Curated annotation (Swiss-Prot):
Taxonomy, superkingdom: Eukaryota
Comment, domains: The presence of a 'disulfide through disulfide knot' structurally defines this protein as a knottin.
Protein name per its UniProtKB record: Leaf cyclotide 2
Keyword Methyltransferase: no
Post-translation changes: This is a cyclic peptide.
Pfam families per the UniProt record, alphabetical: Cyclotide (PF03784)
InterPro entries: Cyclotide, Cyclotide_moebius_CS, Cyclotide_sf
GO BP terms in the entry: defense response; hemolysis in another organism
Family statement: Belongs to the cyclotide family. Moebius subfamily.
Covalent link Cyclopeptide (Gly-Asn), residues: G27-N26
Described purpose of this protein according to its UniProt entry: Probably participates in a plant defense mechanism. Has hemolytic activity.
């Protein structure tokens, strides 16, 4: 994703705060 989710929330869609503080796009930290 490239984005970070220190708040446990992604700012960009298609990503989830799985590997905090980083977002996972389709299960990948891209």
């Amino acid at each position: 994703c490239g984005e970070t989710c220190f708040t446990g929330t992604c700012y960009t869609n298609g990503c989830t705060c799985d590997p905090w503080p980083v977002c996972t796009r389709n299960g990948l930290p891209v």
